[PDB]
């Protein structure tokens, strides 16, 4: 069993404690048009509810956020379809929740912690002289649908509220979808579209990853739940955008279950056929899931996936604890054996009593579920 | 695209029912909710009295009667699914009945999550308020003009059921609620003067884990009776009484009713149709009924069973059990088509005459329903007598009340038949001539008989049969036309008319006149409270083509209508429908004119023309179920009846009828003697209504249906529930269609507690008997069914798409496609193709088989070796539930409205994704309308229509039609129940048993009718004062948008029903080109002909 504090990574201690905290929430009306600033050096896709850590030192970015704090506190994170020609049709708004200004080495620096809020549709990207861009965006509403049975049942059967619990789920299907007999589809078909059902199917995989998981940590709402799960699936950029386009929590959960079932091996994106890890080695060392976004000392965001065993990896250099994202663990650079692609890091415990004693931090940009 | 939607059949299913004194404080009333309809009745004690039927601009959710303090009768509260609230009072003044709004308003909240246990509408016993549970965490209060409302923060979020407690100083509500700890019953006191909740009279007592309903019991008892799965418990603070009867374990109690007003007896009803009596605690099983949605105790012993899954009922609760042991006996059955889970249009009987066979009901109430336009006849005798020119019934015995003689007329001859019970025999009535053609004969004044022939008027006595009087034209001329009642005779001799009176042993010539032109037809039917003496004579003339109302005896012209044309009036008739007097006049071209007639003045008003046939129509009056009707004999035989003081015309299912008369004999009671070109048939008429419904009970669930013409039979997918027996398998619950098959069979495996058993039934298109039943594999769930010809093969195969369903599995991993051949009264399995998923849908795609396997879409080729071969595949990422086609254009559908259009490239041998659309909403049905359009059913009882230079434009579909139907469509079907203004015809079947029709309109015809709708809505008074625009607004929990590209045919059709000055108001400045009211009558009439 694991004795590491799963909460520790989510707090981004490497970013330093003693940060100005903001509480007040900003939310734009659905389908409403907005003009939001874009941080020039962010290239990661942000899913709503996901924590984005930043370490900004470019004067134009520092001044951008410093001004952003004085107002809205929200910026636009673009989901690039082609990162090279910097093409993006969708994105997510990020609201700063923790902020800190420092001055060191002749520069003004700022460290932020933002959170995904609202998905948007890019309407036009206008660029400012300072380098930072603005984005005319259209807020995409989250589409909440009622029970599959809500419409069909306007009757007496309405007041039938929702090991060994295996039979409860059977009694649940038989009961909740009894009115399917009035329709042209079976109760087992309606299950494939039931938020509670789809969620318990996902919760099944989440418990295979976090062996020490308590259901209270997980969101109850399928809207927050579909998004939390979306952000910890080590998938390619093309598939991630497809997931970000999804308007329904049901369509999202259904998508995630398909990805989860068809996922087997995780290879090196560069040589494509070199297997690095498998679905069975993934485990949640953080509360926000097996995979999460972290910042290196130069502001580059690495979405890293925690696995117990990795295969064709070569380490270089000796372990370091500098800027470690998992406190109590030292990291050593890991590359693909075949091509030399930087795959992430090997994390090793600094104390003999720690569990896990070793794990692997693999960046998703280096992986391919092929 | 612009469409027109109309109701072919109103919803049949019962949503709720109540008893009270709504009409008068004397009459016991039964109010039945059939969704958008409200049927109001009086308990006849010897039946059910139909008073009024009112339609509404909403789906009824809540329906509860109430009398607040001093009132002459009862006030009715109704709340719609769209949160329209109204208090309705009854108002009657003579033959004029009107429902009156007393208060109205929309109770919907700006925010809030609509509760899981649905809308709950309770009322305080003292009529102090209305309690509404529409949203979780709130309790809305309407203190019973604009229905002013307010909320109360209700702490316990998950409320199961709630009722207002009886006998309380301060109004109290008792509710079953669930929390993570468990399910507990609680009390709260609702304050109006403080607009808040305060601690209830008693403690939060813990109830059953599956406690479902609260039953508020009146004084002297008080408190509440909580009902669960295994237990029935009672709570009154420090008073408790917990019982767990085993008899209620099998099924959950879904509905109740109060029997004794004090609260000593309650009716209880489960999901299996078992009826229980909760006595004050003891429970006793009474018997079996239809699966009751709602129950109502009325009068003494009689119970109303309001069923949504099957035919509704009237049953008797006897004090003594019968031989079987049932204290329940069925009196009357009420046809319910709901739910329509699948259907098809088949030309059974006559080609061109479409019939609709549906998969109706569920479980033990499962049935087939055959819906055919027009009334039918039940033949009891058939006689070879060609060339009948007339039919008349006689009572040759004055001492007898029944017709024992039938008189037939032929070219220049008269034959007489005697009815010795069921035996028809050739005879000669003494006094009557057989060598002359008869124009009339019947029983007349002073125990006499009359015979009007081409030569004379003969008066015959009954004791004995002999000629007592005879009348002839003075120059021995021939009688041309003749009319006769009981005291009077009016005969034409070319242009001349003669008025005679029937006296004892005398035919007295009262008066005579000469007409302007030749006489064509005559009628002297006495109307109103005229004791067999008519002061009026209706006459049709040649050349001028006029219908004239003449006075008797003077022969004075009262009115003269110029019918217009070159076609002479052939038949004329004066009649009374629903106490309103009318004049009917039929022309030689099959056209029928019908006016209202003033008995005092003689004025013909409200001229209406209807096209009945191609041949001259003959009008004969007959009685059916103590109601006067008119049979219109032509090549399209029709019954002319009255419904809401408007004349209705329903067709008869007979090739042609030339002449008819009503025969009421000892052997043939309350019968109809009908004659065509070759034969005379004596029979009984069906129910006088537009559509006819034949019921084929299956006693199991019909799921799917299709038709094989080459086999003269239907393919029906059905399922029956069986229980796990103390053996290596299962046993049935009752005999059903799949068990009682003529010849039986089971599937042979080649692939690797209550059970659902699936079957393929084979039913003969005439008898409707289960010729064969093929039982599917254990755990095999049959999904899709198609009867087609594939490849080069000339044999029609019944194809079934299955899914192997296991509890552990969520999405079927296995499935089959099974090809069957129906030969020698037994299904022969041709091909068995195992697939890696569920076969949700299958369609015959240009000699190939298109079938969905979960997410994938497969095209199969049928080889000479007689087995399907995989051609091309399309992997969709969206479940292929819906699969519709037209040419090389394919529609793929998801339950969440994710539509995508595919195209098969023949030379490439692959699928091309034309367009896609993903806008999540629940979708129940979809059908392709044409090459560029498709129709569908969307969440919150709506209908939609999607349509088809740049790629990012052509690859996207646009939503052109949006309409709130108020019904849940399960099936769309191309066809018509009828034998140009509109394009196409798609029928639709709903959960409530409602059938509808969707047709296309032109751009300007749509605008004409849309403009007309806005004008009609300014005239028409809405029940509960709901705006029609609001009712038809495409509605979801999210958005409410006005209806687009759709015309409410039901609203358009009520133009023919509004007052004539109101029609003038609607058409005034309507239109650019001007529109006459006469132009708009024709257009609206033309639209009523589509259904
Ligand atoms: N000090 C440097 C310097 C350059 C790049 C990196 C670091 C560094 O510490 N990490 C990761 C290693 C793994 C970790 O836990 N935190 C990091 O910031 C880098 O990518
Ligand atoms: Zn590599």
DSSP B283-331: EEEEEE-S-EEEEEE-SSSEEEEEESSS-EEEEEE-SS--SS--SEEEE
Q: Label the pairing between strands B312-317 and B328-334.
A: antiparallel
Tokens 């979960």 belong to which residue? Answer: B854
Task: Determine the atom of ligand 1 nearest the C-alpha atom of A295.
Answer: 18
Question: How far is A114 from A12, CA to CA, in rounded Å?
Answer: 12
Sign of CA dihedral B143, B147, B148, B154: positive
Ligand nearest to the CA of A292: 1
Strands (E), B36-182: 37-43, 48-55, 60-66, 75-80, 84-93, 96-106, 120-123, 130-133, 140-142, 158-164, 172-178
Angle between the N-to-C axes of helices A222-230 and A195-209, in degrees from 0 to 180, rounded to the nearest 10: 40
Most B CBs within 10 Å, among A161, A177, A251, A259, to test the B interface: A161
Question: Residue B185 corresponds to which tokens in the numbers above?
Answer: 């019953």
Secondary structure (DSSP) of B726-775: SSSSEEESS--TTTS-SEEEEPPP----EEEEEEEEEEETTT--EEEEEE
Question: Residue B813 corresponds to which tokens in the numbers above?
Answer: 């991993």
Question: How far is A212 from A1, CA to CA, in rounded Å?
Answer: 8
Mark yes or no for CB contact B810/A162 under 8 Å: no
- Quick one: B134 and B154 in the same domain? yes
CB-count exposure of residue A121 (10 Å: 0-12, 13-18, 19+):
middle
- Cβ atoms of B11 and B994 within 8 Å: the answer is yes
CB-count exposure of residue B731 (10 Å: 0-12, 13-18, 19+):
exposed
What is the separation, in whole angstroms, between the first and last Cα of chain A? 31
- Cβ atoms of A347 and A361 within 8 Å: the answer is yes
DSSP secondary-structure letter at A306?
E
Q: B984 in helix, strand or coil?
A: strand
DSSP secondary-structure letter at B433?
-
Nearest Cα to A162, choosing from A150, A175, A152? Answer: A175
Q: B140 in helix, strand or coil?
A: strand
Task: Determine the atom of ligand 1 nearest the C-alpha atom of A322.
Answer: 9
Nearest Cα to B66, choosing from B122, B147, B115, B14? Answer: B122
Mark yes or no for CB contact B881/A181 under 8 Å: no
Q: A117 in helix, strand or coil?
A: strand
- Cβ atoms of B573 and B619 within 8 Å: the answer is yes
Q: What residues have CB less than 8 Å from B650, skipping those under 6 apart? A: B373, B374, B375, B638, B639, B641, B688, B689, B690
Question: How far is A153 from A179, CA to CA, in rounded Å?
Answer: 7
- Quick one: B438 and B457 in the same domain? yes
The alpha helices in chain A, defined as continuous H runs, are 7-10, 59-69, 166-176, 187-191, 195-209, 222-230, 237-245, 249-262
Question: How far is B403 from B412, CA to CA, in rounded Å?
Answer: 25
Question: How far is A255 from A261, CA to CA, in rounded Å?
Answer: 10
Question: How far is B352 from A283, CA to CA, in rounded Å?
Answer: 68
- Overall number of domains in chain B: 4
Nearest Cα to B970, choosing from B372, B359, B366? Answer: B359
Question: How far is B512 from B535, CA to CA, in rounded Å?
Answer: 15
Q: B1052 in helix, strand or coil?
A: helix
- Cβ atoms of B482 and B522 within 8 Å: the answer is yes
Q: B1081 in helix, strand or coil?
A: helix
Angle between the N-to-C axes of helices A249-262 and A195-209, in degrees from 0 to 180, rounded to the nearest 10: 40
Q: A143 in helix, strand or coil?
A: strand
B750, HSE (Cβ side, Cα atoms, 13 Å)? 13
Question: How far is B424 from B270, CA to CA, in rounded Å?
Answer: 53
Of the three residues B646, B665, B690, the one that is the final residue of a domain is B690
* Torsions phi, psi for B895 (to 5 deg): -70, -15
Question: How far is B572 from B561, CA to CA, in rounded Å?
Answer: 13
Give the number of residues written for chain A.
Answer: 370
* Assigned CATH class of A194-263: mainly alpha
B10-32 CB burial, b ≥16 within 10 A, e <16: bbbbbbbbbbbbbbeeebbbbbb
**Minimal Cα distance from A146: which residue of B?**
B1037
- Quick one: B238 and B287 in the same domain? yes
H/E run at residue B1018: helix B1003-1019
| Residue B157 lies in domain | 14-336
Query: In what order do the strands lie in the sheet containing B659-663?
Result: B377-384, B679-685, B671-675, B659-663
Pocket test for ligand 1, best of A13, A285, A322, A362 (most atoms within 8 A of CB): A322
DSSP secondary-structure letter at A179?
G
Sign of CA dihedral A152, A154, A156, A162: positive
- Quick one: B881 and B853 in the same domain? yes
DSSP secondary-structure letter at A29?
P
Quick check: B972 contacting A, CB < 8 Å?
no
H/E run at residue B907: none
A339-353 CB burial, b ≥16 within 10 A, e <16: eebebbbbbbbeeee
Question: Residue A74 corresponds to which tokens in the numbers above?
Answer: 């929200």
CB-count exposure of residue B389 (10 Å: 0-12, 13-18, 19+):
middle
H/E run at residue A39: none
- Cβ atoms of B162 and B152 within 8 Å: the answer is no
Q: What residues have CB less than 8 Å from A91, skipping those under 6 apart? A: A46, A76, A77, A78, A79, A119, A120, A122, A135, A137
Q: A157 in helix, strand or coil?
A: helix
Mark yes or no for CB contact A154/B341 under 8 Å: no
Question: Residue B86 corresponds to which tokens in the numbers above?
Answer: 């109204």
Interface of A with B (CB under 8 A): 143-148, 150-162, 170, 181-186, 188-193, 197, 201, 247-248, 250-251, 255, 258
Nearest Cα to B570, choosing from B595, B555, B600, B590? Answer: B590
What is the separation, in whole angstroms, between the first and last Cα of chain B? 21
Question: How far is B256 from B213, CA to CA, in rounded Å?
Answer: 9
- Cβ atoms of B380 and B684 within 8 Å: the answer is yes
- Quick one: B788 and B827 in the same domain? yes
Question: How far is B150 from A254, CA to CA, in rounded Å?
Answer: 40
Torsion of CA B719, B721, B725, B730, to 10 degrees: 0
Question: Residue A81 corresponds to which tokens in the numbers above?
Answer: 């379809």
Gaps in chain B after residue (C–N beyond 2.5 Å): 144, 280, 752, 948, 979, 1071
- Cβ atoms of B112 and B139 within 8 Å: the answer is no
Of the three residues B976, B1000, B1024, the one that is the final residue of a domain is B1000
> Nearest-5° angle of CA B643, CA B1061, CA B630?
25
Q: How many CB atoms lie within 10 A of CB B1025?
A: 13
Nearest Cα to B843, choosing from B801, B873, B878? Answer: B801
Q: What residues have CB less than 8 Å from B996, skipping those under 6 apart? A: B5, B6, B7, B8, B965, B967, B969, B987, B988, B990
- Cβ atoms of B158 and B171 within 8 Å: the answer is no
CB-count exposure of residue A163 (10 Å: 0-12, 13-18, 19+):
exposed
> Nearest-5° angle of CA B378, CA B383, CA B384?
135
DSSP secondary-structure letter at B177?
E
Question: Residue B688 corresponds to which tokens in the numbers above?
Answer: 């006088």
User: What 3 state SS string does B691-719 have?
Assistant: EEEEEEECCCEEEEEEEECCCCEEEEEEE
- Quick one: B954 and B1024 in the same domain? no
Nearest Cα to B805, choosing from B813, B795, B797? Answer: B813
Question: Residue B687 corresponds to which tokens in the numbers above?
Answer: 């129910």
Q: What is the CA radius of gyration of chain A?
A: 22
- Quick one: B986 and B1017 in the same domain? no
For this entry, resolution in Å reads: 3.5
Question: How far is B215 from B164, CA to CA, in rounded Å?
Answer: 9
> Nearest-5° angle of CA A50, CA A51, CA A54?
135
- Quick one: B1011 and B1054 in the same domain? yes
H/E run at residue B993: none
Question: How far is B210 from A160, CA to CA, in rounded Å?
Answer: 8
Cβ-Cβ contacts under 8 Å, A170 against chain B = 807
- Quick one: B225 and B350 in the same domain? no
H/E run at residue B128: none
Residue whose Cα lies nearest atom 11 of ligand 1: it is: A296
> How was this entry determined?
X-ray
* Assigned CATH class of A16-140: mainly beta
- Cβ atoms of B470 and B463 within 8 Å: the answer is no
Nearest Cα to B405, choosing from B437, B446, B365, B451? Answer: B451
Question: How far is B910 from B912, CA to CA, in rounded Å?
Answer: 7
Angle between the N-to-C axes of helices A222-230 and A249-262, in degrees from 0 to 180, rounded to the nearest 10: 30
- Quick one: B378 and B444 in the same domain? yes
Question: How far is B1042 from B323, CA to CA, in rounded Å?
Answer: 60
Question: How far is B595 from A104, CA to CA, in rounded Å?
Answer: 101
Mark yes or no for CB contact B810/A192 under 8 Å: yes
H/E run at residue B591: strand B591-597
- Cβ atoms of B558 and B551 within 8 Å: the answer is yes
H/E run at residue B547: strand B546-551
Tokens 């969709």 belong to which residue? Answer: B876
Mark yes or no for CB contact A157/B810 under 8 Å: no
In chain A, where the domains are located: 1-15+264-370, 16-140, 194-263
Query: In what order do the strands lie in the sheet containing B910-917?
Result: B882-886, B889-893, B899-905, B910-917
Question: How far is B1061 from B1053, CA to CA, in rounded Å?
Answer: 17
Tell me the CA distances in angstroms from A96 to A30, A71, A304, B111, one per residue in order: 21, 11, 21, 28
Q: How many CB atoms lie within 10 A of CB B863?
A: 14
- Cβ atoms of B42 and B50 within 8 Å: the answer is no
Question: Residue B760 corresponds to which tokens in the numbers above?
Answer: 């393929």
Residue whose Cα lies nearest atom 19 of ligand 1: it is: A296
- Quick one: B163 and B38 in the same domain? yes
Domain A1-15+264-370 has CATH 2.170.150.20: yes
φ/ψ region of B819 (left if φ > 0, alpha if ψ in -120 to 50, else beta) reads beta
Q: A63 in helix, strand or coil?
A: helix
Q: What residues have CB less than 8 Å from A56, skipping those under 6 apart? A: A39, A41, A62, A65, A109, A110, A111, A112, A299
Tokens 């004596």 belong to which residue? Answer: B682
Q: What is the CA radius of gyration of chain B?
A: 33
- Cβ atoms of B611 and B625 within 8 Å: the answer is no
Nearest Cα to B704, choosing from B614, B602, B799, B768? Answer: B799
Nearest Cα to A132, choosing from A63, A38, A59? Answer: A38
Find the CATH number of the domain harbouring B410: 2.130.10.10
> Any binding-site annotation on A232?
no
The number of angstroms, rounded, from the C-alpha of B804 to the middle of its chain's C-alpha atoms is 37
Question: How far is A230 from A50, CA to CA, in rounded Å?
Answer: 9
CB-count exposure of residue B608 (10 Å: 0-12, 13-18, 19+):
middle
Question: How far is B849 from B818, CA to CA, in rounded Å?
Answer: 12
Nearest Cα to B754, choosing from A182, A173, A189, A192? Answer: A173
Question: How far is B1039 from A145, CA to CA, in rounded Å?
Answer: 12
**Minimal Cα distance from B113: which residue of A?**
A146
Strand partners, B937: B925, B943
Chain B, window 732-791: residues with a beta carbon less than 8 angstroms from a chain A beta carbon: 781, 783
Q: What residues have CB less than 8 Å from B92, skipping those under 6 apart? A: B23, B98
Strands (E), B454-517: 457-462, 465-471, 481-484, 488-493, 496-503, 506-514
H/E run at residue B1063: helix B1060-1067
Question: Residue B497 corresponds to which tokens in the numbers above?
Answer: 């008319």
- Quick one: B1032 and B984 in the same domain? no
CB-count exposure of residue B319 (10 Å: 0-12, 13-18, 19+):
exposed
Angle between the N-to-C axes of helices B1060-1067 and B1003-1019, in degrees from 0 to 180, rounded to the nearest 10: 130
- Cβ atoms of B671 and B706 within 8 Å: the answer is no
Find the CATH number of the domain harbouring B1067: 1.10.150.910
**Residues, Cβ < 5 Å to ion ligand 2:** A 268, 270-271, 274, 336, 338-339, 341
Angle between the N-to-C axes of helices A237-245 and A249-262, in degrees from 0 to 180, rounded to the nearest 10: 150
Cβ-Cβ contacts under 8 Å, A160 against chain B = 212, 252
């Amino acid at each position: 069993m694991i004795n590491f504090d799963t909460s520790l990574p989510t707090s981004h201690m490497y970013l330093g404690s003693d940060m100005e905290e903001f509480h007040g929430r900003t939310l734009h009306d659905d389908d409403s048009c907005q003009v939001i600033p874009v941080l020039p050096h962010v290239m990661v896709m942000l899913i709503p509810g996901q924590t984005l850590p930043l370490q900004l030192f470019h004067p134009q970015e520092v001044s951008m956020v410093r001004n952003l704090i004085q107002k809205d506190r929200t910026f636009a994170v673009l989901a690039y379809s082609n990162v090279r020609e910097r093409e993006a049709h969708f994105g997510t708004t990020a609201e700063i929740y923790a902020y800190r200004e420092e001055q060191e080495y002749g520069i003004e620096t700022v460290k932020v912690k933002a959170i995904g809020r609202q998905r948007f549709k890019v309407l036009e990207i206008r660029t400012q002289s300072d380098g930072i861009q603005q984005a005319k965006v259209q807020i995409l509403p989250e589409r909440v649908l009622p029970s599959t049975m809500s419409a069909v049942q306007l009757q007496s059967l309405s007041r039938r509220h929702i090991r060994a619990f295996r039979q409860w789920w059977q009694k649940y299907q038989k009961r909740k979808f009894h009115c399917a007999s009035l329709t042209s589809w079976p109760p087992w078909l309606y299950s494939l579209y039931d938020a509670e059902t789809l969620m318990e199917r996902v919760k099944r995989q989440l418990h295979e990853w976090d062996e020490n998981l308590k259901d209270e940590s997980l969101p109850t709402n399928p809207i927050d739940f579909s998004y939390r799960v979306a952000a910890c699936l080590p998938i390619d950029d093309a598939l991630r955008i497809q997931l970000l386009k999804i308007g329904s929590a049901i369509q999202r959960l259904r998508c995630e279950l398909d990805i989860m079932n068809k996922c087997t091996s995780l290879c090196c994106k560069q040589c494509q056929d070199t297997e690095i890890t498998t679905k069975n080695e993934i485990f949640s060392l953080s509360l926000c899931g097996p995979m999460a976004a972290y910042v290196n000392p130069h502001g580059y965001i690495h979405e890293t996936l925690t696995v117990y065993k990795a295969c064709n990896l070569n380490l270089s250099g000796r372990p370091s604890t500098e800027h470690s994202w998992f406190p109590g663990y030292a990291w050593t650079i890991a590359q693909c054996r075949i091509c030399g692609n930087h795959m992430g890091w090997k994390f090793t415990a600094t104390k003999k009593d720690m569990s896990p004693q070793k794990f692997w931090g693999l960046t998703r940009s280096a992986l391919l579920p092929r | 695209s612009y469409n027109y939607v109309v109701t072919a059949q109103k919803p049949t299913a019962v949503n709720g029912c109540v008893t009270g004194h709504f009409t008068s404080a004397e009459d016991l009333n039964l109010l039945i909710a059939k969704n958008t309809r409200l049927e109001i009745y009086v308990v006849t004690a010897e039946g059910l009295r139909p008073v009024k039927e009112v339609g509404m601009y909403g789906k009824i959710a809540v329906m509860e009667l109430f009398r607040p303090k001093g009132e002459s009768k009862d006030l009715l509260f109704i709340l719609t699914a769209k949160y329209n609230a109204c208090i309705l009072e009854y108002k009657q003044s003579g033959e004029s009945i009107d429902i009156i709004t007393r208060a109205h308003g929309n109770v919907q909240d700006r925010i809030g999550r609509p509760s899981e246990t649905g809308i709950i509408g309770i009322i305080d016993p003292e009529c102090r308020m209305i309690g509404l549970r529409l949203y979780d965490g709130l309790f809305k209060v309407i203190p019973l003009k604009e229905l002013k409302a307010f909320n109360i923060r209700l702490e316990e979020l998950h409320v199961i059921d709630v009722k207002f407690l009886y006998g309380c100083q301060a109004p109290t509500i008792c509710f079953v609620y669930q929390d993570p700890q468990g399910r507990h019953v609680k009390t709260y006191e609702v304050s109006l003067r403080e607009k808040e909740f305060n601690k209830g009279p008693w403690k939060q007592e813990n109830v059953e884990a599956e406690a479902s309903m609260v039953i508020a019991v009146p004084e002297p008892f008080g408190g509440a009776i909580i009902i669960g799965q295994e237990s029935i418990t009672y709570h009154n603070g420090d008073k408790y009484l917990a019982i767990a009867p085993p008899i209620i374990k099998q099924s959950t109690i879904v509905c109740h009713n109060r029997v004794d007003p004090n609260g000593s007896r309650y009716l209880l009803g489960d999901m299996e149709g078992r009826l229980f009596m909760l006595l004050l605690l003891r429970v006793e099983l009474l018997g079996e009924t239809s699966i009751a949605e709602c129950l109502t105790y009325l009068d003494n012993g009689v119970v109303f069973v309001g069923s949504r899954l099957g035919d509704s009922q009237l049953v008797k609760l006897n004090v003594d059990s019968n031989e079987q042991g049932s204290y329940v006996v069925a009196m009357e059955t009420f046809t319910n088509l709901g739910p329509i889970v699948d259907m098809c249009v088949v030309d059974l009987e006559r080609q061109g005459q479409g019939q609709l066979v549906t998969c109706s009901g569920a479980f033990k109430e499962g049935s087939l329903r055959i819906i055919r336009n027009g009334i039918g006849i039940h033949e009891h005798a058939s006689i070879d007598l060609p060339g009948i020119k007339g039919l008349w019934p006689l009572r040759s015995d004055p001492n007898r009340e029944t017709d024992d003689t039938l008189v037939l007329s032929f070219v220049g001859q008269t034959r007489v038949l005697m009815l010795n019970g069921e035996e028809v025999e050739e005879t000669e009535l003494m006094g009557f001539v057989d060598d002359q053609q008869t124009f009339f004969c019947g029983n007349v004044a002073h125990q006499q008989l009359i015979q009007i022939t081409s030569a004379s008027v003969r008066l015959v006595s009954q004791e004995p049969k002999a000629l007592v009087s005879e009348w002839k034209e003075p120059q021995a001329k021939n009688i041309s036309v003749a009319s006769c009642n009981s005291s009077q005779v009016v005969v034409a001799v070319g242009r001349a008319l003669y008025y005679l009176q029937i006296h004892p042993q005398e035919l007295r010539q009262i008066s005579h006149t000469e007409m302007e032109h030749e006489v064509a037809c005559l009628d002297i039917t006495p109307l109103g409270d005229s004791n067999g003496l008519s002061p009026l004579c209706a006459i049709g003339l040649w050349t001028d083509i006029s219908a004239r109302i003449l006075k008797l005896p003077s022969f004075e012209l009262l009115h003269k209508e110029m019918l217009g044309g070159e076609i002479i009036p052939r038949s004329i008739l004066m009649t009374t429908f629903e106490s309103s007097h009318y004049l009917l006049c039929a022309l030689g071209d099959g056209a029928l004119f019908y006016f209202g007639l003033n008995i005092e003045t003689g004025l013909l008003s409200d001229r209406k023309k209807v096209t009945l046939g191609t041949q001259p129509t003959v009008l004969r009056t007959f009685r059916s179920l103590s109601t006067t009707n008119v049979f219109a004999c032509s090549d399209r035989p029709t019954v002319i009846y009255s419904s809401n003081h408007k004349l209705v015309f329903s067709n008869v299912n007979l090739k042609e009828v030339n002449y008819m008369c009503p025969l009421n004999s000892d052997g043939y009671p309350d019968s109809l003697a009908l004659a065509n070109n070759s034969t005379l048939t004596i029979g009984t008429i069906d129910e006088i209504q537009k559509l006819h419904i034949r019921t084929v009970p299956l006693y199991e669930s019909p799921r799917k249906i299709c038709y094989q013409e080459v086999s003269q039979c239907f393919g029906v997918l059905s399922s029956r529930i069986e229980v796990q027996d103390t053996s290596g398998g299962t046993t049935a619950l009752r005999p059903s269609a799949s068990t009682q098959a003529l010849s039986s069979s089971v599937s042979s495996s080649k692939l690797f507690e209550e059970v659902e058993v699936h079957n393929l039934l084979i039913i003969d298109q005439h008898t409707f008997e289960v010729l064969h039943a093929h039982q599917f594999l254990q755990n095999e769930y049959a999904l899709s069914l198609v009867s087609c010809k594939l490849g080069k093969d000339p044999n029609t195969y019944f194809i079934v798409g299955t899914a192997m369903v296991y509890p552990e599995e969520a999405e079927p991993k296995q499935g089959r496609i099974v090809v069957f051949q129906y030969s020698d009264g037994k299904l022969q399995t041709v091909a068995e193709k195992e697939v890696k998923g569920a076969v949700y849908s299958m369609v015959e795609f240009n000699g190939k088989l298109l079938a969905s396997i979960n997410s994938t879409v497969r095209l199969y080729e049928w080889t000479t070796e007689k087995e399907l071969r995989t051609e091309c595949n399309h992997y969709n990422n969206i479940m292929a539930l819906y699969l519709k086609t037209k040419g090389d254009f394919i529609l793929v559908g998801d339950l969440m409205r994710s539509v995508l259009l595919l195209a098969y490239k023949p030379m490439e041998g692959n699928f091309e994704e034309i367009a896609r659309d993903f806008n999540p909403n629940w979708m129940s049905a979809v059908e392709i309308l044409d090459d560029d359009n498709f129709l569908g059913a969307e969440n919150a009882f709506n209908l939609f229509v999607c349509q088809k230079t740049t790629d990012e434009e052509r690859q996207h579909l646009q939503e052109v039609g949006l309409f709130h139907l108020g019904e849940f469509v399960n099936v769309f079907c191309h066809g018509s129940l009828v034998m140009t203004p509109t394009q196409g015809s798609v029928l639709f079947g709903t959960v409530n048993g409602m059938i509808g029709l969707v047709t296309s309109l032109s751009e300007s015809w749509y605008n004409l009718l849309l403009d007309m709708q806005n004008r009609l809505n300014k005239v028409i008074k809405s029940v509960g004062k709901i705006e029609h625009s609001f009712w038809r607004s495409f509605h979801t929990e999210r958005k409410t948008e006005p209806a687009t590209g759709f015309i409410d045919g039901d609203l358009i059709e009520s133009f023919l029903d509004i007052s004539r000055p109101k029609m003038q108001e609607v058409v005034a400045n309507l239109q650019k080109r001007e529109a006459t009211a006469d132009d708009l009558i024709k257009v609206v009439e033309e639209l009523t002909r589509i259904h």
